[PDB]
């Protein structure tokens, strides 16, 4: 019931909070930067303040203090569902508080009234070739939508730093509302013979309109979509996509530009693209070893994949050190809905083998699986076999998280992200020599 | 030190590098290089050095050093057009990549190579020709880059299962093609918007990259050709902590292709606090003229400056995250004006500001740096030569910046830098970590 008002009052409490805190500990040390950290992608450096979520290496992600199961229980469900609606999540990430069902409905409704594409985007999408990857299409379409930016106007217009957050809030609501429109058009155009996406039923929830535009009607596939979109929404801020959005948002680029840049990062093979990668490898697996393999043959398939310089897709993590609750959460879902699925059973079998392999191999820090290892198998089951699209789905979810933070970054006037770089030759000089 | 094919040269260079970093890392990987305080975390990583970037290094007191070289030094050492004064961007790219100063031949080969690789796919052209005039030039550029990704050789190869070792090779190809296509793209944007969709003509395999650019832009003055060589050379790289450089670095570390990494960087560059400043300094200067008139007094200037600050606004093209003095790129450009457009009224106003602004900023006590940066002096040079469409200004900066960023991109891959993935913290957790306040 008026998320903008809600924010309007939470803001100054928090501004207060930090100032006083910074006054006290501004110069207090929270860490040490090492030569290896610099060469190792800031591995283990605590270099960002990100509010919407925190990641625990052992326990996983907590969204505003809540774990996945906690959310699963707490957040409002649909009419007669079991899976939490992403609208709730979004309210939670933004507010810090559990939304009521009324609040949740208000969002759905808000996201329905704002879903609307400019024709220039439409045309573009319609002229894209079928050889251009869906993420690229997605990314390029978003960038193009920036002509609609309110923040971009207000800013040129001369707004006060103070009001920045309000513009960003509108840009943010509008993008999340349109994303499914762009995502759906992409699918259709690529996989549905360019058929129309149709309309938004103002009376449905965001996932539900999305699935319609996609042209899927299994009510269970709807529930999946809800779960899918909830769980991929945020993953603290050091992740490539979030960080990107955050780094780019810092220069004051609008939310369209920022999200788009984040998509380019999500699309990397070591990141969100792994969604799709996993699937491709699982398929090729099935071709070779066949539908039902022996643990023994599975091992070698991995033992091979390894001494051959390749990584096992969906396994490993920069931060997590244990099995990702996102993975588990998905597996519980399969267990309740597609337990007899062959692909599913394989994924399941992989779970018992890879970790030991990745343990005797001795390189990976995290021998366990991440969300990526398990999403595709679910999708595929419901008929969405177009694996080059999976990352798009992840992208649409990630907007929830990143944008929720975008508002806060500007509301708290976080400045330009600009660290200092060094050359090896200078680092050597600093230390002495290697 | 030298012969013609960059690729062969690189290939040789590479392994010695790796060995070095390796042993160095062997003795000191655990050797602490610095801090981490609460303030730097909230402060956008200000003052934290936590990134390796080989191509350039910025000294806060002296300015950018290319591969140990300063601008003036590059200014003299680098090869020039047959009959120019200005360094050619091709030479700088070579320097940046190889860490060595190129010969004329060496440069010529680069030009030829960039000429050769210059080709846009139809879909991109279609797309560009279909964009509305209200779609900012930077968005066009960024969306065009992303869509060109259909061509990525690294992407393809990667999917086909190449070895981590070979990665750099495809990135070298993708970068070369991208440096090569950029002007085509940029020119098409300019044409479309300001030249009633006329055609960009063709590439002259014999010309230098900038020359072919100005031709496609429709600019024929040699002085402007010369300005372009300088411009593209000077906005090249600025160590890796700047938004654009860092964004390409971050995205590339994920194995996204160069097209993707670059386009993302473009989105950072388009930020009002970043490359977009180019444009703002000009919009700001225009407004200023309109009010104050042409021959304003220092006192009137000063005041207008104070107005801007009180409106809660920043003086455009002044201040910097790292630099603590006047940017050498600023100076460099002032010298060029001094020599070629000593009496432009706009030029004169920039010069005036130069003597007024830093004192006011000093007085206001906010800015760590009260001196000018590159973006404060670039638009005036363009304007003078007829390129008066300021919304396009950052596009040229972007074309320039592809040189630094792509040069390191190859190196990061060549050197196997991993995924850039830091640790985020919430205020609450941070507090808890400390005691709170
Ligand atoms: C995600 C990941 C890149 C994390 O990077 P990083 O923190 O450097 O891994 P690490 O610290 O455990 O690296 C130690 C070594 O083990 C290797 N390793 C790590 N994970 C794996 C894996 N799943 N399979 C094989 N080798 C692996 C690393 O490549 C590295 O080897 P080398 O020393 O020869 O470079 C890494 O786990 C990986 O490559 N994963 C496979 C990626 C994939 O296809 N799907 C999973 C999604 S990637 C998700 C991320 O963005 C994340 F945060 F996890 F990095
Ligand atoms: C580049 C800049 C963003 C660096 O930011 P930062 O490192 O945070 O500067 P800082 O620490 O000195 O700023 C401290 C205070 O001085 C103010 N200040 C800094 N520069 C200026 C300026 N040019 N005019 C007025 N006030 C300024 C800051 O806004 C800040 O005020 P507050 O604390 O009340 O928010 C900054 O000086 C600025 O805003 N410049 C003007 C931007 C512009 O339109 N053109 C110049 C190109 S920006 C160069 C860069 O480094 C960047 F990375 F941003 F691209």
XYZ file of N, CA and C in Angstrom, chain A residues 17-18 20-22 24-51 53-55 120 123-124 127-129 131-133 136 139-140 143-144 146-147 155 158 160-161 235-240 243-244 247-248 250-253 257 260-261 264-265 267-271 277 308-309 317-319 414-425 427-428 430-431 433-434, chain B residues 20-21 23-25 27-39 41-54 56-58 123 126-127 130-132 134-136 139 142-143 146-147 149-150 158 163 238-243 246-247 250-251 253-256 260 263-264 267-268 270-274 280 311-313 320-322 366 417-428 430-431 433-437:
624
model
N 21.468 6.478 11.138
C 22.113 5.296 11.620
C 23.574 5.139 11.140
N 23.770 5.265 9.855
C 25.086 5.093 9.266
C 26.075 6.207 9.674
N 26.203 8.330 12.196
C 26.635 8.147 13.532
C 27.619 6.987 13.603
N 27.288 5.892 12.919
C 28.145 4.705 12.905
C 29.508 5.020 12.273
N 29.489 5.747 11.156
C 30.684 6.109 10.433
C 31.543 7.060 11.232
N 31.845 7.013 14.381
C 32.486 6.155 15.360
C 33.583 5.233 14.819
N 33.247 4.451 13.755
C 34.147 3.437 13.188
C 34.717 3.693 11.799
N 34.430 4.844 11.266
C 34.945 5.180 9.978
C 36.340 4.638 9.715
N 37.186 4.759 10.693
C 38.560 4.367 10.429
C 38.941 3.058 11.025
N 37.972 2.431 11.631
C 38.204 1.127 12.155
C 38.413 0.166 10.988
N 39.426 -0.693 11.134
C 39.823 -1.681 10.139
C 39.013 -2.958 10.194
N 38.584 -3.415 9.024
C 37.794 -4.611 8.933
C 38.528 -5.613 8.081
N 39.767 -5.300 7.718
C 40.461 -6.235 6.871
C 41.797 -5.721 6.388
N 42.469 -6.617 5.676
C 43.817 -6.551 5.124
C 43.829 -6.954 3.629
N 44.470 -6.179 2.802
C 44.496 -6.495 1.400
C 45.807 -7.173 1.118
N 45.803 -8.367 0.493
C 47.063 -9.062 0.218
C 47.433 -9.154 -1.253
N 48.682 -9.400 -1.513
C 49.102 -9.506 -2.887
C 48.256 -10.505 -3.692
N 47.835 -11.534 -3.011
C 47.103 -12.567 -3.667
C 45.664 -12.180 -3.873
N 45.135 -11.333 -3.001
C 43.758 -10.892 -3.149
C 43.547 -10.127 -4.403
N 44.580 -9.328 -4.748
C 44.637 -8.456 -5.891
C 44.721 -9.220 -7.178
N 45.561 -10.240 -7.177
C 45.684 -11.108 -8.325
C 44.488 -12.072 -8.383
N 43.832 -12.293 -7.269
C 42.727 -13.268 -7.214
C 41.303 -12.757 -7.230
N 41.032 -11.686 -8.023
C 39.666 -11.161 -8.185
C 39.012 -10.725 -6.882
N 39.830 -10.104 -6.075
C 39.353 -9.649 -4.787
C 38.807 -10.801 -3.945
N 39.307 -11.983 -4.198
C 38.794 -13.084 -3.416
C 39.037 -12.898 -1.932
N 37.931 -12.915 -1.210
C 37.973 -12.733 0.223
C 38.109 -11.274 0.663
N 38.083 -10.306 -0.260
C 38.143 -8.965 0.276
C 36.750 -8.483 0.532
N 36.534 -7.843 1.706
C 35.226 -7.278 2.026
C 35.269 -5.849 1.551
N 34.825 -5.630 0.304
C 34.939 -4.311 -0.290
C 33.664 -3.525 -0.645
N 32.483 -4.034 -0.331
C 31.237 -3.377 -0.671
C 30.213 -3.396 0.460
N 29.407 -2.354 0.589
C 28.259 -2.372 1.487
C 26.993 -2.639 0.606
N 26.343 -3.806 0.795
C 25.150 -4.241 0.095
C 24.132 -4.767 1.090
N 22.975 -4.090 1.133
C 21.905 -4.234 2.127
C 20.814 -5.250 2.007
N 20.738 -8.182 0.857
C 21.045 -9.557 1.202
C 22.485 -9.807 1.586
N 22.643 -10.888 2.371
C 23.953 -11.333 2.842
C 24.184 -12.833 2.652
N 25.413 -13.122 2.316
C 25.722 -14.473 2.075
C 26.694 -15.051 3.093
N 9.936 1.456 -30.352
C 11.291 1.303 -30.841
C 11.901 0.026 -30.324
N 10.206 -3.036 -32.378
C 10.779 -3.164 -33.726
C 12.128 -3.860 -33.715
N 12.970 -3.327 -32.875
C 14.287 -3.880 -32.639
C 14.162 -5.381 -32.359
N 13.302 -7.311 -35.357
C 14.290 -7.398 -36.447
C 15.544 -8.168 -36.061
N 15.639 -8.581 -34.820
C 16.817 -9.313 -34.431
C 16.864 -10.617 -35.198
N 18.086 -11.105 -35.465
C 18.270 -12.390 -36.115
C 18.222 -13.504 -35.074
N 20.285 -15.808 -34.679
C 21.663 -16.200 -34.342
C 22.221 -15.342 -33.200
N 21.476 -14.291 -32.847
C 21.864 -13.408 -31.748
C 21.320 -14.006 -30.457
N 22.208 -14.321 -29.539
C 21.861 -14.905 -28.278
C 20.812 -14.115 -27.488
N 21.930 -11.424 -25.285
C 22.361 -10.218 -25.975
C 21.191 -9.394 -26.382
N 19.769 -7.808 -23.196
C 20.631 -6.722 -22.820
C 20.466 -5.483 -23.700
N 20.537 -5.668 -25.043
C 20.432 -4.567 -25.997
C 19.075 -3.861 -25.929
N 18.963 -1.530 -22.794
C 19.752 -0.377 -22.998
C 18.950 0.658 -23.742
N 18.204 0.179 -24.726
C 17.389 0.976 -25.620
C 16.181 1.568 -24.962
N 16.374 2.897 -22.256
C 16.822 4.030 -21.433
C 16.277 5.420 -21.857
N 15.801 5.568 -23.113
C 15.181 6.808 -23.614
C 13.966 7.193 -22.779
N 17.660 14.079 -13.492
C 19.068 14.425 -13.344
C 19.488 15.551 -14.330
N 18.277 18.763 -13.286
C 18.837 19.459 -12.168
C 18.282 19.084 -10.817
N 17.934 17.538 -6.969
C 18.788 17.548 -5.808
C 19.155 16.124 -5.394
N 20.424 15.902 -5.044
C 20.861 14.564 -4.709
C 19.844 13.819 -3.868
N 21.756 -12.205 -4.372
C 22.828 -13.073 -3.912
C 24.023 -12.270 -3.403
N 23.666 -11.313 -2.534
C 24.543 -10.362 -1.960
C 25.127 -9.546 -3.072
N 25.998 -8.596 -2.766
C 26.428 -7.759 -3.841
C 27.777 -7.996 -4.501
N 28.582 -8.967 -4.053
C 29.880 -9.143 -4.695
C 29.763 -9.983 -5.957
N 28.559 -10.490 -6.225
C 28.406 -11.301 -7.447
C 28.585 -10.442 -8.692
N 29.050 -11.032 -9.788
C 29.308 -10.241 -10.985
C 28.170 -9.340 -11.451
N 27.366 -6.670 -8.580
C 28.467 -5.752 -8.503
C 28.441 -4.807 -9.689
N 28.266 -5.378 -10.881
C 28.240 -4.573 -12.112
C 27.217 -3.455 -12.043
N 28.360 -0.978 -9.574
C 29.499 -0.166 -10.041
C 29.046 0.856 -11.055
N 28.280 0.381 -12.027
C 27.721 1.247 -13.047
C 26.709 2.271 -12.458
N 26.768 3.606 -9.674
C 27.572 4.576 -8.981
C 27.919 5.806 -9.781
N 28.133 5.670 -11.113
C 28.509 6.830 -11.935
C 27.301 7.688 -12.176
N 26.179 7.216 -11.642
C 24.878 7.793 -11.815
C 24.257 7.376 -13.172
N 24.655 6.239 -13.760
C 23.986 5.816 -14.994
C 22.585 5.413 -14.596
N 20.509 1.462 -17.973
C 21.894 1.279 -18.298
C 22.559 0.346 -17.310
N 21.306 -3.364 -17.699
C 21.785 -3.870 -18.967
C 23.220 -4.303 -18.828
N 24.024 -3.449 -18.168
C 25.416 -3.792 -17.963
C 25.519 -5.048 -17.148
N 25.125 -8.203 -19.125
C 26.290 -8.590 -19.868
C 27.191 -9.451 -19.016
N 27.148 -9.227 -17.696
C 27.977 -10.008 -16.786
C 27.351 -11.343 -16.442
N 25.624 -12.989 -18.352
C 25.839 -13.795 -19.546
C 27.196 -14.487 -19.622
N 28.104 -14.236 -18.698
C 29.399 -14.892 -18.818
C 29.285 -16.338 -18.358
N 30.011 -17.216 -19.063
C 30.066 -18.662 -18.833
C 30.345 -19.123 -17.399
N 31.108 -18.314 -16.644
C 31.424 -18.593 -15.256
C 30.358 -17.999 -14.336
N 29.282 -17.452 -14.910
C 28.267 -16.803 -14.106
C 26.881 -17.337 -14.400
N 24.877 -23.718 -19.658
C 26.003 -24.662 -19.783
C 25.717 -26.065 -19.199
N 41.586 -32.698 -18.604
C 41.181 -32.296 -19.923
C 40.880 -30.832 -19.830
N 41.280 -30.265 -18.678
C 41.172 -28.848 -18.350
C 39.802 -28.165 -18.342
N 31.976 -22.401 -6.074
C 31.456 -21.108 -5.677
C 32.569 -20.244 -5.177
N 32.493 -18.950 -5.451
C 33.507 -18.015 -5.027
C 33.546 -17.827 -3.519
N 32.339 -17.827 -2.922
C 32.074 -17.586 -1.498
C 31.532 -18.789 -0.760
N 25.634 6.706 -1.691
C 26.885 6.034 -1.843
C 27.508 6.666 -3.050
N 28.802 6.889 -2.981
C 29.473 7.561 -4.045
C 30.032 6.622 -5.114
N 30.754 7.259 -6.029
C 31.436 6.596 -7.130
C 32.361 5.489 -6.636
N 32.182 4.319 -7.216
C 33.039 3.177 -6.912
C 34.213 3.337 -7.819
N 35.365 3.573 -7.202
C 36.599 3.891 -7.895
C 37.797 3.530 -7.029
N 38.276 2.285 -7.062
C 39.460 1.936 -6.265
C 40.705 2.270 -7.028
N 41.812 1.903 -6.414
C 43.108 2.102 -7.012
C 43.631 0.790 -7.637
N 44.185 0.897 -8.827
C 44.773 -0.242 -9.509
C 46.291 -0.128 -9.400
N 46.935 -1.267 -9.655
C 48.382 -1.364 -9.674
C 48.829 -2.334 -10.750
N 50.006 -2.051 -11.276
C 50.743 -2.824 -12.216
C 51.641 -3.774 -11.422
N 51.984 -4.912 -12.014
C 52.824 -5.887 -11.328
C 54.160 -5.248 -10.961
N 54.673 -4.461 -11.900
C 55.929 -3.767 -11.744
C 55.920 -2.831 -10.560
N 53.720 -3.151 -7.924
C 53.462 -3.975 -6.763
C 54.810 -4.507 -6.292
N 55.630 -4.872 -7.278
C 56.953 -5.368 -6.992
C 57.747 -4.307 -6.268
N 56.635 -1.807 -4.581
C 56.002 -1.585 -3.292
C 56.593 -2.517 -2.257
N 56.524 -3.817 -2.563
C 57.043 -4.897 -1.740
C 58.591 -4.969 -1.788
N 60.280 -7.212 -4.748
C 60.465 -7.990 -5.976
C 60.086 -9.477 -5.861
N 59.694 -10.097 -6.951
C 59.351 -11.507 -6.827
C 60.196 -12.367 -7.747
N 57.126 -14.716 -14.303
C 57.402 -13.614 -13.427
C 56.312 -13.493 -12.375
N 55.093 -13.206 -12.841
C 54.020 -13.031 -11.903
C 54.021 -14.208 -10.952
N 56.470 -16.283 -9.831
C 57.468 -16.311 -8.785
C 57.254 -15.214 -7.790
N 56.868 -14.081 -8.314
C 56.590 -12.934 -7.496
C 55.525 -13.321 -6.510
N 54.448 -13.838 -7.066
C 53.313 -14.284 -6.311
C 53.731 -15.374 -5.313
N 56.829 -15.633 -3.705
C 57.442 -14.991 -2.567
C 56.457 -14.151 -1.732
N 55.623 -13.292 -2.402
C 54.715 -12.339 -1.731
C 53.213 -12.443 -1.851
N 52.621 -13.551 -2.250
C 51.179 -13.513 -2.357
C 50.479 -13.159 -1.049
N 51.133 -13.477 0.055
C 50.595 -13.232 1.382
C 51.101 -11.919 1.996
N 51.955 -11.221 1.257
C 52.485 -9.961 1.698
C 51.422 -8.855 1.618
N 50.997 -8.386 2.785
C 49.974 -7.355 2.927
C 50.331 -6.012 2.281
N 49.459 -5.572 1.391
C 49.636 -4.332 0.654
C 48.793 -3.191 1.201
N 47.875 -3.491 2.115
C 47.093 -2.393 2.613
C 45.964 -2.876 3.441
N 45.349 -1.851 3.990
C 44.181 -1.635 4.819
C 42.937 -2.335 4.414
N 41.861 -1.741 4.924
C 40.405 -1.947 4.738
C 39.603 -1.396 5.892
N 39.152 -0.186 5.764
C 38.392 0.391 6.851
C 36.952 0.609 6.511
N 36.197 0.946 7.514
C 34.786 1.142 7.313
C 34.468 2.193 6.311
N 35.258 3.206 6.369
C 35.088 4.319 5.502
C 35.301 4.002 4.016
N 34.761 1.176 2.457
C 33.650 0.337 2.109
C 32.421 1.162 1.759
N 32.141 2.149 2.567
C 31.007 2.996 2.313
C 31.303 4.002 1.245
N 32.613 4.315 1.138
C 33.175 5.344 0.235
C 33.486 4.891 -1.182
N 32.830 3.824 -1.658
C 33.061 3.372 -3.030
C 34.504 2.917 -3.280
N 35.081 2.252 -2.264
C 36.406 1.679 -2.314
C 37.516 2.694 -2.457
N 37.223 3.912 -2.038
C 38.182 4.992 -2.109
C 39.427 4.753 -1.350
N 40.532 4.765 -2.113
C 41.809 4.552 -1.509
C 42.172 3.089 -1.347
N 41.321 2.175 -1.800
C 41.758 0.822 -1.648
C 42.389 0.350 -2.901
N 43.581 -0.179 -2.805
C 44.099 -0.710 -4.023
C 43.823 -2.190 -4.035
N 42.943 -2.601 -4.915
C 42.662 -4.008 -4.896
C 42.334 -4.562 -6.246
N 43.158 -4.225 -7.222
C 42.974 -4.650 -8.590
C 44.296 -4.637 -9.336
N 44.597 -5.644 -10.146
C 45.830 -5.565 -10.945
C 45.516 -5.155 -12.382
N 46.157 -4.091 -12.884
C 45.888 -3.619 -14.235
C 47.225 -3.206 -14.808
N 47.695 -3.907 -15.812
C 49.040 -3.674 -16.315
C 49.312 -2.536 -17.249
N 48.214 0.770 -17.736
C 48.511 2.116 -17.262
C 48.367 2.144 -15.777
N 49.059 3.161 -15.207
C 49.095 3.454 -13.779
C 49.006 4.937 -13.602
N 48.081 5.315 -12.743
C 47.845 6.693 -12.442
C 48.502 7.059 -11.132
N 22.435 -6.795 -39.662
C 21.555 -6.667 -38.483
C 21.942 -5.467 -37.634
N 20.895 -2.461 -39.699
C 19.428 -2.393 -39.625
C 18.979 -1.722 -38.325
N 19.521 -2.234 -37.227
C 19.242 -1.780 -35.904
C 19.553 -0.314 -35.767
N 17.285 2.048 -37.307
C 15.915 1.977 -36.833
C 15.617 2.662 -35.495
N 16.694 3.131 -34.892
C 16.685 3.810 -33.644
C 16.151 5.199 -33.815
N 15.421 5.624 -32.807
C 14.826 6.943 -32.753
C 15.862 7.994 -32.441
N 15.723 10.193 -30.491
C 15.751 10.530 -29.069
C 16.526 9.537 -28.197
N 16.995 8.476 -28.830
C 17.797 7.461 -28.175
C 19.216 8.003 -28.130
N 19.704 8.298 -26.908
C 21.019 8.872 -26.720
C 22.111 8.148 -27.487
N 23.591 5.067 -25.867
C 22.738 3.883 -25.831
C 22.777 3.127 -27.148
N 26.221 1.459 -27.249
C 26.204 0.295 -26.366
C 25.354 -0.897 -26.920
N 24.108 -0.611 -27.322
C 23.229 -1.631 -27.873
C 23.812 -2.201 -29.167
N 26.693 -4.618 -28.117
C 26.159 -5.847 -27.595
C 25.699 -6.796 -28.731
N 24.924 -6.238 -29.708
C 24.387 -6.975 -30.854
C 25.435 -7.470 -31.828
N 27.738 -8.958 -30.933
C 28.311 -10.103 -30.239
C 28.157 -11.430 -30.933
N 27.269 -11.436 -31.945
C 26.911 -12.557 -32.822
C 28.170 -13.111 -33.501
N 35.103 -20.649 -27.001
C 34.837 -21.108 -25.667
C 33.810 -22.264 -25.609
N 40.961 -24.630 -24.444
C 41.821 -24.656 -23.280
C 42.134 -23.276 -22.736
N 43.311 4.753 -18.404
C 43.481 5.553 -17.203
C 43.495 4.653 -15.995
N 44.421 3.688 -16.051
C 44.557 2.653 -15.061
C 43.239 1.906 -15.009
N 43.125 0.838 -14.217
C 41.884 0.032 -14.251
C 40.807 0.280 -13.200
N 41.009 1.233 -12.297
C 40.017 1.537 -11.279
C 38.866 2.466 -11.753
N 39.015 3.144 -12.914
C 37.925 3.985 -13.408
C 36.738 3.094 -13.772
N 35.521 3.638 -13.703
C 34.263 2.892 -13.931
C 34.238 2.062 -15.183
N 37.191 -0.642 -15.072
C 36.783 -1.619 -14.064
C 35.571 -2.445 -14.470
N 34.582 -1.797 -15.073
C 33.424 -2.558 -15.557
C 33.854 -3.595 -16.622
N 35.646 -6.453 -14.815
C 34.763 -7.254 -14.023
C 33.927 -8.185 -14.882
N 33.378 -7.627 -15.935
C 32.579 -8.432 -16.833
C 33.421 -9.467 -17.577
N 36.203 -10.813 -16.581
C 36.644 -11.874 -15.686
C 35.649 -13.038 -15.609
N 34.441 -12.821 -16.098
C 33.406 -13.850 -16.023
C 33.389 -14.668 -17.299
N 34.346 -14.370 -18.133
C 34.409 -15.014 -19.410
C 33.363 -14.477 -20.419
N 32.761 -13.335 -20.148
C 31.908 -12.781 -21.179
C 32.844 -12.262 -22.303
N 30.619 -7.909 -25.272
C 29.815 -7.773 -24.061
C 30.506 -6.927 -22.966
N 30.626 -3.274 -24.158
C 29.332 -2.607 -24.148
C 28.957 -2.233 -22.713
N 29.268 -3.141 -21.784
C 28.967 -2.874 -20.383
C 29.702 -1.635 -19.852
N 28.164 1.581 -20.836
C 27.116 1.921 -19.892
C 27.702 2.630 -18.644
N 28.957 2.307 -18.214
C 29.615 3.002 -17.069
C 30.058 4.380 -17.521
N 28.812 6.243 -19.784
C 27.681 7.124 -20.030
C 27.127 7.776 -18.767
N 27.785 7.449 -17.640
C 27.344 8.003 -16.359
C 27.730 9.460 -16.241
N 26.819 10.243 -15.700
C 27.069 11.651 -15.552
C 28.314 11.962 -14.742
N 28.707 11.035 -13.847
C 29.869 11.224 -12.975
C 31.115 10.713 -13.654
N 30.933 10.082 -14.789
C 32.026 9.526 -15.544
C 32.206 10.216 -16.919
N 28.336 17.409 -20.396
C 27.904 18.348 -19.350
C 28.769 19.606 -19.234
N 23.246 25.854 -5.576
C 22.121 25.114 -6.145
C 22.230 23.635 -5.799
N 23.274 23.287 -5.034
C 23.606 21.931 -4.662
C 24.165 21.138 -5.865
N 24.789 21.835 -6.815
C 25.348 21.205 -8.004
C 26.871 21.202 -8.028
N 38.402 14.611 -9.131
C 38.799 13.281 -9.616
C 38.949 12.337 -8.436
N 38.704 11.051 -8.639
C 38.765 10.156 -7.517
C 40.167 9.947 -7.037
N 41.124 10.038 -7.966
C 42.484 9.740 -7.623
C 43.440 10.896 -7.783
N 35.285 21.189 0.108
C 34.733 19.847 -0.053
C 35.570 18.863 -0.859
N 43.680 -14.116 -15.015
C 43.091 -13.592 -13.817
C 41.769 -14.243 -13.674
N 41.379 -14.519 -12.469
C 40.083 -15.153 -12.258
C 38.923 -14.187 -12.175
N 37.806 -14.781 -11.758
C 36.552 -14.127 -11.498
C 36.663 -13.038 -10.424
N 36.252 -11.826 -10.764
C 36.282 -10.778 -9.767
C 35.054 -10.916 -8.882
N 35.267 -11.336 -7.672
C 34.147 -11.591 -6.770
C 34.548 -11.342 -5.337
N 34.220 -10.127 -4.927
C 34.448 -9.669 -3.569
C 33.304 -10.141 -2.671
N 33.452 -9.747 -1.399
C 32.549 -9.961 -0.284
C 31.810 -8.659 0.108
N 30.489 -8.714 0.047
C 29.592 -7.632 0.361
C 29.306 -7.795 1.830
N 28.838 -6.713 2.423
C 28.528 -6.625 3.821
C 27.340 -5.738 3.995
N 26.477 -6.030 4.935
C 25.412 -5.076 5.201
C 25.842 -4.167 6.372
N 25.133 -3.055 6.572
C 25.466 -2.160 7.645
C 25.339 -2.883 8.946
N 24.211 -3.549 9.058
C 23.938 -4.309 10.251
C 25.065 -5.287 10.564
N 27.967 -5.260 9.405
C 29.195 -4.560 9.589
C 29.331 -4.127 11.049
N 28.210 -3.595 11.535
C 28.106 -3.100 12.896
C 28.413 -4.220 13.828
N 29.962 -6.801 13.298
C 31.361 -7.164 13.102
C 32.254 -6.348 14.016
N 31.911 -5.053 14.171
C 32.631 -4.069 14.993
C 32.142 -3.883 16.447
N 30.869 -3.496 16.620
C 30.203 -3.199 17.893
C 29.010 -2.285 17.629
N 29.064 -1.630 16.476
C 28.017 -0.727 16.056
C 28.325 0.688 16.498
N 27.496 1.623 16.068
C 27.711 3.013 16.439
C 26.462 3.786 16.061
